């Protein structure tokens, strides 16, 4: 069948969150309070597209 269409390595370059898991768990409730809207746009796009390649941006 067809060629699978994968995005380029420049499309996956983004500034990562390089903190440990306990750092994330300590600020998890305030992150859920403050950073709501793009996180829920992302999880809505992720459960509607069912394809991570459409959900990169």
């Amino acid at each position: 069948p067809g060629i699978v269409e994968l995005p380029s390595l420049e499309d996956l370059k983004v500034q990562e969150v390089k903190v440990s898991s306990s750092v994330l768990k300590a600020a998890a409730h305030h992150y859920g309070a403050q950073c709501d809207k793009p996180n829920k746009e992302f999880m809505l796009c992720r459960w509607e597209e069912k394809d991570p390649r459409r959900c990169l941006e």
């Binding site: 999880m43 992720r46 459960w47 069912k50 394809d51 991570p52």
Partner: protein, 63 residues
């Protein structure tokens, strides 16, 4: 009995039995077609009911 009675009774018997013979041959032809194609109401072997499928948002999105 009269010859009219026996004659037309024979015609009734021949009509009934000729219709039964042609419908037996049509019965064989219909059964052959529905077994070969499966597009009729016979030999409808069961498949999975699609009402059993859960369409809820699952634990992971990639499905």
């Amino acid at each position: 009995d009269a010859p009219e009675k026996n004659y037309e009774r024979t015609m009734a018997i021949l009509q009934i039995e000729s219709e039964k013979a042609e419908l037996r041959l049509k019965e064989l032809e219909v059964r052959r077609l529905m077994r070969a194609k499966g597009d009729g109401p016979w030999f409808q072997y069961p498949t999975i009911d699609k009402a059993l499928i859960d369409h809820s948002p699952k634990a992971t999105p990639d499905n």
